[PDB]
Amino acid sequence: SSELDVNTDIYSKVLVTAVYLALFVVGTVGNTVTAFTLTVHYHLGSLALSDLLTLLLAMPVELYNFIWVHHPWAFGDAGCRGYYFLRDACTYATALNVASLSVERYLAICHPFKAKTLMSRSRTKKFISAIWLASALLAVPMLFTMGEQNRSADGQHAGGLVCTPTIHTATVKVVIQVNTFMSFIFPMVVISVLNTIIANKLTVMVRQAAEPGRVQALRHGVRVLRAVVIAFVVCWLPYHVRRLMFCYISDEQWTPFLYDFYHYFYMVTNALFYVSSTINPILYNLVSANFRHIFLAT
Amino acid sequence: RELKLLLLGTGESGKSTFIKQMRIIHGSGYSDEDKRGFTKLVYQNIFTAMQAMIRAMDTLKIPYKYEHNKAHAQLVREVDVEKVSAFENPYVDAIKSLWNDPGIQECYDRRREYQLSDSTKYYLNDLDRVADPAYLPTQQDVLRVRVPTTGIIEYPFDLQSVIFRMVDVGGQRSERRKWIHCFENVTSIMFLVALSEYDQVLVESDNENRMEESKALFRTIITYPWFQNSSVILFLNKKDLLEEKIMYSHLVDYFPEYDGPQRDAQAAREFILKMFVDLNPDSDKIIYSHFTCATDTENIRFVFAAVKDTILQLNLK
Amino acid sequence: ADLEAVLADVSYLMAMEKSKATPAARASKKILLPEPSIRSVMQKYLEDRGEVTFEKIFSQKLGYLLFRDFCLKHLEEAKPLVEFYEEIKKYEKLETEEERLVCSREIFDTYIMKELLACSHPFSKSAIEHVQGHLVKKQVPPDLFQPYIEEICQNLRGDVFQKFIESDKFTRFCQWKNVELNIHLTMNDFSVHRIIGRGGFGEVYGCRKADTGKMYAMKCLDKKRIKMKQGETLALNERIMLSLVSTGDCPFIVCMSYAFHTPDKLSFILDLMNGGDLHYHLSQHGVFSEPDMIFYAAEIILGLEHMHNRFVVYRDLKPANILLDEHGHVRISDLGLACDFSKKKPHASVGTHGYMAPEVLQKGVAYDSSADWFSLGCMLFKLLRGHSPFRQHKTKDKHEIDRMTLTMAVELPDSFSPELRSLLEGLLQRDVNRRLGCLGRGAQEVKESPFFRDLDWQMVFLQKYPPPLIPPRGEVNAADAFDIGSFDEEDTKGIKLLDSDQELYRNFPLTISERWQQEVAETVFDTINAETDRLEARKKTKNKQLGHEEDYALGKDCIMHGYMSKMGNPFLTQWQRRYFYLFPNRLEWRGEGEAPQSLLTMEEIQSVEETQIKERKCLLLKIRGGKQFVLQCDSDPELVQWKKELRDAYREAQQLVQ
Amino acid sequence: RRPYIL
Ligand SMILES: COc1ccccc1C1CCN(c2nc(C3(F)CC3)nc3ccc(N(C)CCO)cc23)CC1
Ligand SMILES: Nc1nc2c(ncn2[C@@H]2O[C@H](COP(=O)(O)OP(=O)(O)O)[C@@H](O)[C@H]2O)c(=O)[nH]1
Ligand code: ALF
Ligand SMILES: [Mg+2]
């Protein structure tokens, strides 16, 4: 009956939850004030909203039955599906919002005129609504794949059931493999390429100028424009590589030591994943003073 | 160092003849090779005159006296001076018969109705000698050959103690436009007007009298603002032609304003000189005129003897 | 500085400097000329108002360009005449006599002496004698060839102009004119860059016109702010003044090119003076010196002379209202408070404290351009001392400054030379009747002052002096956009723009023909002309290959023809563009080229009217029996002329039937 | 064993 437990240290749970709460009190407020503060404005607001919902949805529910010591699922069979669907939808929203924000910055800095028509001003609201809809549309498998299962050998214990991939490991593997490319590799490459070319366009300006803060401003601009990609790497790659080590490795290799190591890796990867939610308004403040004025005023 | 001169005037006026005379007197006389070349020039001049007068006879529809020469006349129409050579036996007899023909003689006496070289009579009188295979033209024959000059031709030359470079230019209306470039540093202008042009119309135009065009050009040249510091000399050439044209033609018909007595060559010459000198806009300017005849060496010698002195006095540096 | 402001500055500067050697490439939108069939309508449109005379076309920039291009490439007879005219006009712009001497000699040799020698000269004898007398006397006035200019114009007015009219380059002129007369500007036609100033009812931004790439300054006035401050009259008077002074060629006033309005903003498009105002430069450079101030005083005096010649009083003259251009020359910019004193001399106290004339402060006393001279005196005193002759803002209260009415300027000899002291004494007189420029010759009274004795005013007009300050080229020359700020949108809350409010600005939008034509000639005339030539060549070749030429000789008695769109049913595509032919007895209508068919005989026309449909103006032809047709034209001139000629045909047909 | 939490 009690074969499905995890032996991660309780003090580790306390530390993880404290860090989670700190990141929450940061992001949940920062992203909301950013959304209120507000073509790039629409993209920034959409990204802030995606981060805000990620923190509001993933962190709390996971904090007890996943990010705590109790293995039995406590949100019900419907919760088994709703939690994962919401998590996947918010992850897609964040990744695609970052990609679209990079695209918008590219258009503004490299195509100043035609961007007015292509962005079509107020139609950027419809564009961000479309990206949110696509994010919600790409996460349907999280509804009918993570359902409650009677996993315990007894089948009637106090924790015999828990939310797990229903389908065979092959289908879980293929769905996760498409998910990683559609949510990490594609946005990652788009962001990296566009940010690199924008940084080149800023460096040519810096060379041409080579002012009191113009040089400093452009230097910090390129610094942050690269730190964005570095933060994407750090915050996102661990999550997807953990999911890969979950889905790809079959029953042959699994051992209690690696089992517990993966469980701790869960805490580490999720902490890194949530760090990205808070990182955004920090960089927004560190970049632009005009935005910082309203942000600190409000 | 050397002073620049211009020889201006309407086409056919006689500028190139004066250039030849100046070269002969104060230059290098023409050599045997020169005369050998000029032989062919005289030949095509005679051929051109013959063709022109036959064409005039045809256009004027003047009947011929000699029926046989008509065949020769047709042959004359067939002669082309582009592939020209020396005169041949079959042509000399035909030319002699034509010239001896009274009808074409009357046509030529009526030459005022068409263009014709003033040297036609001289060559016709020469006849056999010029057409003889042993052709050794004298200085007169070379001088009395017509070759239309075109483009600016600077002729360097010097006096006994000073250097005066001349400039010969074409006189045809189409070519006068090219003079713009030869006015740079003119020191004195020599202007040539044919005294006998009062009867013949231009070549380029068959309705405007030659004398009117010459007077207009003289006025245009004097009107030039930048010639105010350059002297002008008006050579009245072809007096030997006018002394006969007036005797044969009444100056009243051409210019009725010449109400002087008829047949007075001196009176007509004085009238022409006064008419030309009147065209000057401002009397303060001085115009020097000299009756002359380029075909006579002595007249050119006498005229130049004083022209050089006048030019030297005009420019002291 | 923040990244986003720095990037805005960099983008603005790059757009200002982009492709400066190739202005044709700076454009992002492309001008699309109508099809060459437009002339059938446009020639009648221009003839009905007498705009196709030689004087009318030849005096237009595009008209002159096209006429000269026709003469020098498609009519050998007019080639020498146009070459002579162009050479004379080049000669007229030589300032020095030494160069003008050789220029005149060359012109006379090339275009007079050669022709006269050839006897090909057609010009009169008065002109020949006048010119030769002028050269022989060693005189080369700029108006030396004026008789020749007049005679060339007389010669060109003859068969040359008719041959131009029947040519295809008059068709190109009609196409360009249709493009000109169909200007409908919106905010999407300009690339709006960062803010450069704020004040009054609105703000000022640097902008680039999309279809030509020319840099402009856009002054946007908010309609809600206008209503809240009851400034509709001021807003309309500003447009009146801008159009009044822009009609000319003064280089000392910021001229207006276009005026247009959005649902919320009024907008003026003005010359861009990227050098910045003179108060910014005064704060940086500090007080100028008298030799440095001669330049500004002379330029400002000429600008004021222009405005006063147009009966405008510039009630707001400050160092802040003077804008420096790229090379450092100054212009008067803000005509918001300008007024016309010809109809009735104003009496309101308007201006800035420390610069308002004593008669402007005195309550109810009328004043004229006089006030501008007192303001000029105060402005020069500030330039030389850093503050107005009376206490500045930080030195005294507004009323204390206004006490200028009861005292006199110090006239500090330690900082002013005796001639400058005399000038400032004359300009800062309390009594109007004894003030410089307030009596006698007006501006000429000031221009002849001892202070300007060593200044040739024609050279001032031509701007040949060296400016004492060249604005930096790598900087905006304006306060940071954060410093400029923005108006509080909360202030206009509770303000509704009723139809009665928008009705005031019904005829607000305006375009100035000469300014637009100069812009087009400078930037994109040749490129668009060559491109359109290529498109027309392709169209003609395709038509020849496949038949169906442009028109079958336009029938035998056609009055007009051209494209229009027929409408009337929501159930089919409504933009049914097809070619219409107008005859005194009927209006023919033809498809893609297969065959025409009779649409209406003019006996049917009950009446011709206009309507507004789908944000477009369309004609409405009411047909006997209750039927109706809706025709939508491609431009305003089309609509006007089609309405006029349909009305004429209908009226004449009914009168004949009567 | 095998992880149940994805
Ligand atoms: C590539 O941009 C991304 C991609 C992913 C995540 C975050 C960012 C931010 C990078 C910094 N930032 C801005 N970057 C740039 C650059 F891309 C370097 C030119 N210009 C700006 C201009 C304004 C602004 N605001 C805070 C708007 C305030 O109203 C932010 C930026 C916002 C997006
Ligand atoms: N009889 C006679 N013939 C002359 C006189 N001057 C020139 N000619 C002839 O006129 C012909 C044409 O003169 P030309 O050399 O062409 O003068 P240009 O036109 O100024 O160059 C020549 O063949 C001369 O022989 C003259 O004074 N008397
Ligand atoms: F008329 Al010429 F040379 F004989 F110009
Ligand atoms: Mg000759």
C6: which chain A residues are within 8 Å (Cβ-Cβ)?
A: 213-214, 217-218
d(CA A292, CA A294): 6
The answer to whether the beta carbons of residues B311 and B187 sit under 8 Å apart is: yes
HSE-CB at A150 with a 13 A cutoff on CA atoms is 5
Active-site residue, C648 included: no
Smallest-distance ligand from the CA of C11: 1
d(CA B316, CA C5): 79
Handedness of CA C253, C254, C258, C263 (dihedral sign): negative
d(CA A1, CA C149): 112
What SS3 class is residue C59?
coil
CA distance C253 to chain B (A): 45
Does A114 contact C at CB distance below 8 Å? yes
Longest dimension (CA), chain A: 75
The answer to whether the beta carbons of residues B17 and B166 sit under 8 Å apart is: no
d(CA B146, CA C200): 90
Q: How many CB atoms lie within 10 A of CB C203?
A: 20
Residue C25 is given by DSSP the state G
Read off the tokens for B196.
């006998």
What SS3 class is residue C221?
strand
* Ramachandran area for residue B94 (φ above 0: left; ψ -120 to 50: alpha; else beta): alpha
Q: What are the backbone dihedrals phi and psi of residue B159, each rounded to the nearest 5 degrees, phi first?
A: -80, -170
CB-neighbour burial class of residue C130 (10 A; exposed 0-12, middle 13-18, buried 19+): middle
Q: Position of tokens 């403040």?
A: A285
Q: Which of B199, B71, A19, C598 is nearest to C589 (CA)?
A: C598
- Residue ranges and CATH numbers for the domains of chain B are 3-27+157-314 (3.40.50.300), 32-143 (1.10.400.10)
d(CA B295, CA B289): 18
Strands B231-237 and B186-194, bridge-based pairing: parallel
CB-neighbour burial class of residue C241 (10 A; exposed 0-12, middle 13-18, buried 19+): buried
Residue C490 is given by DSSP the state G
Q: Which of B149, B166, B176, B182 to mutate to test the pocket of ligand 3 (most atoms within 8 A of CB)?
A: B149
Dihedral (C-alpha) C608, C610, C614, C615: value to the nearest 10 degrees?
150
The answer to whether the beta carbons of residues C153 and C64 sit under 8 Å apart is: no
CB-neighbour burial class of residue C436 (10 A; exposed 0-12, middle 13-18, buried 19+): buried
Within this chain, do residues C294 and C438 fall inside the same structural domain, yes or no?
A: yes
CA C220 to chain centre: 18
Terminal-residue alpha carbon distance, chain B: 10
Break positions in chain C: residue before each gap, C to N over 2.5 angstroms: none
When computed from its CA atoms, the radius of gyration of chain D, rounded to whole angstroms, is 5
Q: How many CB atoms lie within 10 A of CB C229?
A: 14
Q: How many CB atoms lie within 10 A of CB B143?
A: 22
Taking an 8 Å cut-off on Cβ atoms, the answer to whether D6 and A165 are in contact is yes
Q: Position of tokens 């020191």?
A: B187
Read off the tokens for C152.
């060339």
Q: Which of C309, C373, C303, C365 is nearest to C340 (CA)?
A: C309
Read off the tokens for A236.
């996102």
Terminal-residue alpha carbon distance, chain D: 14
Q: Which of C597, C596, C595, C603 is nearest to C621 (CA)?
A: C603
Handedness of CA C67, C68, C73, C78 (dihedral sign): positive
Handedness of CA B172, B176, B181, B182 (dihedral sign): positive
A112: which chain C residues are within 8 Å (Cβ-Cβ)?
A: 11, 15, 191
Read off the tokens for C5.
């402001």
d(CA C591, CA C294): 69
The answer to whether the beta carbons of residues A117 and C29 sit under 8 Å apart is: no
Read off the tokens for B181.
């470039």
d(CA C135, CA B24): 40
Q: Which of B186, B204, B148 is nearest to C118 (CA)?
A: B204
Cα–Cα distance list, B189 to A22, B142, B195, B287, C362 (Å): 109, 26, 19, 10, 80
Q: How many CB atoms lie within 10 A of CB B206?
A: 10
d(CA C623, CA C644): 17
Q: Position of tokens 């990867």?
A: A269
> In the beta sheet, which residues pair with residue C414?
none
Read off the tokens for B28.
């290098």
Cα–Cα distance list, C68 to A100, B43, C86, C162, C176 (Å): 53, 53, 9, 14, 16
Q: How many CB atoms lie within 10 A of CB C575?
A: 10
Longest dimension (CA), chain D: 14
Q: What are the backbone dihedrals phi and psi of residue C37, each rounded to the nearest 5 degrees, phi first?
A: -70, -10
Q: Which of B166, B144, B135 is nearest to B14 (CA)?
A: B144
- CATH code for the domain in which residue C618 is found: 2.30.29.30
Q: Which of C434, C421, C418 is nearest to C389 (CA)?
A: C421
d(CA C120, CA C106): 18
d(CA B25, CA B304): 10
The answer to whether the beta carbons of residues B194 and B12 sit under 8 Å apart is: yes
d(CA A146, CA A166): 6
Q: What are the backbone dihedrals phi and psi of residue A231, each rounded to the nearest 5 degrees, phi first?
A: -65, -40
Within this chain, do residues C432 and C565 fall inside the same structural domain, yes or no?
A: no
Provide CB contacts within 8 A for A11, sequence distance 6+: none
Picking from C109, C132, C135, the nearest residue to B180 by CB comes out as C109
Q: Position of tokens 């003889």?
A: B132
Task: Find the domain containing C133 and state its range.
Answer: 38-181
Residue C36 is given by DSSP the state G
With vertex at residue A137, the alpha carbon angle to CA D4 and CA A263, rounded to the nearest 5 degrees, is 20
d(CA A132, CA A130): 5
Which C residues 206-235 touch A at CB under 8 Å? 210
What SS3 class is residue C46?
helix
Query: What letter represents residue C284's amino acid?
Result: Q
Within this chain, do residues C569 and C465 fall inside the same structural domain, yes or no?
A: no
With vertex at residue B61, the alpha carbon angle to CA B55 and CA B64, rounded to the nearest 5 degrees, is 85
Which sequence spans correspond to the domains of chain A? 1-298
Does C32 contact A at CB distance below 8 Å? no
What SS3 class is residue C498?
coil
> In the beta sheet, which residues pair with residue C246?
none
What are the DSSP calls for B153-222, one per residue? EEE--B-SSSBEEEEE---SHHHHGGGGGG-TTEEEEEEEEEGGGGTSBPSS-SSSBHHHHHHHHHHHHH
Query: What letter represents residue C251's amino acid?
Result: P
Cα–Cα distance list, C576 to C567, C570, C573 (Å): 7, 12, 7
Taking an 8 Å cut-off on Cβ atoms, the answer to whether A262 and D3 are in contact is yes
Taking an 8 Å cut-off on Cβ atoms, the answer to whether B216 and C109 are in contact is no
Provide CB contacts within 8 A for C476, sequence distance 6+: C9, C12, C13, C194, C196, C274, C276
Q: Which residues of C311-346 are buried (b: 16+ CB within 10 A; e: fewer)?
A: ebbbbbbbbbbbbbbeebbbbbbbbbbbbbbeeebb
CB-neighbour burial class of residue C607 (10 A; exposed 0-12, middle 13-18, buried 19+): exposed
Q: Which of C443, C418, C433, C441 is nearest to C298 (CA)?
A: C443
Q: What are the backbone dihedrals phi and psi of residue B288, each rounded to the nearest 5 degrees, phi first?
A: -100, 130
Q: Which of B177, C99, C7, C15 is nearest to A218 (CA)?
A: C7
Q: Which of A31, A34, A40, A107 to mutate to test the pocket of ligand 1 (most atoms within 8 A of CB)?
A: A40
d(CA B70, CA B76): 9
The answer to whether the beta carbons of residues C112 and C104 sit under 8 Å apart is: no
Within this chain, do residues C425 and C286 fall inside the same structural domain, yes or no?
A: yes
The answer to whether the beta carbons of residues B194 and B212 sit under 8 Å apart is: no
Query: What letter represents residue A122's amino acid?
Result: S
d(CA B7, CA C428): 73
User: What DSSP element (H or E) covers C318?
Assistant: none
Within this chain, do residues C74 and C171 fall inside the same structural domain, yes or no?
A: yes
Task: Using the mean position of ligand 4's atoms as its centre, give its distance from the Cα of residue B16 in Å.
Answer: 4
Nearest CA in chain C to A120: C188
Strands C265-271 and C256-261, bridge-based pairing: antiparallel
The answer to whether the beta carbons of residues C242 and C259 sit under 8 Å apart is: yes
Strands C256-261 and C276-277, bridge-based pairing: unpaired
Provide CB contacts within 8 A for B201, sequence distance 6+: B207, B208, B209, B210
HSE-CB at C643 with a 13 A cutoff on CA atoms is 17
> In the beta sheet, which residues pair with residue C267?
C220, C260
Ligand 2 pocket, residue B171 CB under 6 Å = yes
CA distance C220 to chain A (A): 19
d(CA C238, CA C233): 9
Within this chain, do residues C473 and C578 fall inside the same structural domain, yes or no?
A: no
Q: Enumerate the H helices of C144-289 as residue ranges.
A: 146-155, 161-165, 168-181, 223-228, 232-246, 278-285
C202-209, strands of its sheet edge to edge: C190-199, C202-209, C215-222, C265-271, C256-261, C510-511
Method used to obtain the model: cryo-EM
Handedness of CA C272, C277, C281, C284 (dihedral sign): negative
d(CA A26, CA B255): 117
**DSSP collapsed to 3 states, C515-579:** HHHHHHHHHCHHHHHHHHHHHHHHHHHHHHHHCCCCCCCCCCCCCEEEEEEEECCCCCCCCEEEE
Q: Position of tokens 């001639």?
A: C419
The answer to whether the beta carbons of residues C462 and C399 sit under 8 Å apart is: no
Q: Which of A244, A250, A265, A228 is nearest to A94 (CA)?
A: A228
**DSSP collapsed to 3 states, chain A:** CCCCCCCCCHHHHHHHHHHHHHHHHHHHHHHHHHHHHCCHHHHHHHHHHHHHHHHHHHHHHHHHHCCCCCCCCCCHHHHHHHHHHHHHHHHHHHHHHHHHHHHHHHHHHHCCCHHHHHHCCCHHHHHHHHHHHHHHHHCCHHHHCEEEEECCCCCCCCCCEEEEECCCHHHHHHHHHHHHHHHHHHHHHHHHHHHHHHHHHHHHHHHHHCCCCHHHHHHHHHHHHHHHHHHHHHHHHHHHHHHHHHHCCCCCCCCHHHHHHHHHHHHHHHHHHHHHHHHHHHHHHHHCHHHHHHHHHC
d(CA C520, CA C523): 5
> In the beta sheet, which residues pair with residue B5?
B188
d(CA C16, CA C26): 10
Within this chain, do residues C150 and C284 fall inside the same structural domain, yes or no?
A: no
CA C171 to chain centre: 24
Taking an 8 Å cut-off on Cβ atoms, the answer to whether C10 and A290 are in contact is no
d(CA A295, CA B126): 120
Strands C560-567 and C576-583, bridge-based pairing: antiparallel
d(CA C317, CA C394): 20
Q: Which residues of C247-282 are buried (b: 16+ CB within 10 A; e: fewer)?
A: eeebbbbbbbbbbbbeeebbbbbbbbbbbbbbebbb
Q: What are the backbone dihedrals phi and psi of residue B81, each rounded to the nearest 5 degrees, phi first?
A: -85, 0
d(CA A48, CA A34): 7
d(CA B226, CA C387): 61
d(CA B214, CA B205): 13
d(CA A59, CA A70): 16
Taking an 8 Å cut-off on Cβ atoms, the answer to whether C113 and B173 are in contact is no
Does C9 contact A at CB distance below 8 Å? yes
Q: Position of tokens 């940010």?
A: A195
Within this chain, do residues C284 and C169 fall inside the same structural domain, yes or no?
A: no
Nearest CA in chain A to D3: A259
d(CA B7, CA C459): 47
d(CA C423, CA C298): 13
d(CA B131, CA C265): 102
User: What DSSP element (H or E) covers B231?
Assistant: strand B231-237
Within this chain, do residues C567 and C452 fall inside the same structural domain, yes or no?
A: no
Task: Using the mean position of ligand 3's atoms as its centre, give its distance from the Cα of residue B288 in Å.
Answer: 23
- CATH code for the domain in which residue C144 is found: 1.10.167.10
* Ramachandran area for residue C586 (φ above 0: left; ψ -120 to 50: alpha; else beta): beta
> In the beta sheet, which residues pair with residue C381?
none
